[model samples]
Target: EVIKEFMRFKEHMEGSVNGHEFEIEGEGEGRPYEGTQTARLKVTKGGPLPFAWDILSPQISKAYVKHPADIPDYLKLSFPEGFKWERVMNFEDGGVVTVTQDSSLQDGEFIYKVKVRGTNFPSDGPVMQKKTMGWEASSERMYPEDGALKGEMKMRLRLKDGGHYDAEVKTTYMAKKPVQLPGAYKTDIKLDITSHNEDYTIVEQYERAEGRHS
Candidate 1:
């Protein structure tokens, strides 16, 4: 749940193309990485963002960063070109962040999982969806309650063959709103992938923490 929210935040993290720079630390077991890396997220004008992770060391760097000729096959499958991603915003109600890979930039079957060398940002399926906000979108207001919050959210979908599908997601959890912090707080991230199939099958998990410091 926490990681899902983190993904949504990054989707709308920027309004300007100038870009956002971040310093990340390998969290909880270092998530396969133990130190720091400077990462940049930028809009290549529009329709895509380049996520460049620059490792600052020369020793352990070989494990993560290396020459283009030696780029791992897994990374190639993860990001066809260069970790170029696009998250289209739904302008309708309840605005769910639906991401599907752009076909022009990707020729492979799907765009699943986004795993940076040392960050836990969805290391799992094509994180992309249609450009339009299909079906219905809605949200209800929550009254003041001692118990943080509670609600049943849902969406309706009509398949191509005239099939119908929908799910009601009822949830109740403590509200943790962002507070003002004066400095950067790093995160340790780990990504473990199980396998992938033809249709939809993936087992990816992460252990990490990300806080905003302005």
Candidate 2:
């Protein structure tokens, strides 16, 4: 019963942090890449934004920050071990709640901030994108001697979220030999975004049915 009560409150808070997919598509030289990741999101309520829920479909990759720096420090601190969290002892004004949490994940790392004043948080929509590791621009080319060589493939993203995510899987290799360049060598990529709304909606509905609404 206690666990259910906590979950009910959490659901109410999550409703404030709402979002949905924006757009997504992909393209390459000879073929197009199909996106399958289903994203779901929700934010915390009654105080500074707690956290954003990021989900990826089985066929698609999970939406997450590539590294600690990719997201705000408070979020990084959220993972700190034994971090006890609570609303601010005082709010500067109504409709605002200051929050503080302890960070035992790392020693002596201080994290605190004032969040925006809005019931709406980025629950779904889009997140600060995680970097995809692939080919990067390099001054040194494969055929540096020719001074007109093709670019090199970038390092593979082998160390994201401790391997939870991988580099974009749409990479391809071309012939090693020198190739000709037309007057125009255009490359285009399309991104599509979607969400498995049921999870978020179900959670929200349960919260409402339990009278957790604020």
Candidate 1 regions exceeding 4 Å error are: 1-8, 11-135, 141-146, 177-214
Per-residue accuracy of model 2 over 43-143 as CA lDDT, tens digit each: 32332223222221111110111222222222222332322222321111112222222322223222222221122323331221322222121111122
Cα RMSD of predicted structure 1 = 20.7
Q: Which candidate gets the maximum lDDT versus the true structure?
A: 1
- Candidate that would win on TM-score: 1
lDDT of 2: 0.21
At residue 159, give the lDDT of candidate 2.
22
Instruction: Please report how far candidate 1 places residue 102 from its true position, in Å.
Output: 27
For each candidate in turn, the TM-score is 0.22, 0.17
TM-score of 2: 0.17
How many pairs collide in each candidate, listed in order? 16, 14
Worst 10 residues of 2 by lDDT: 205-214
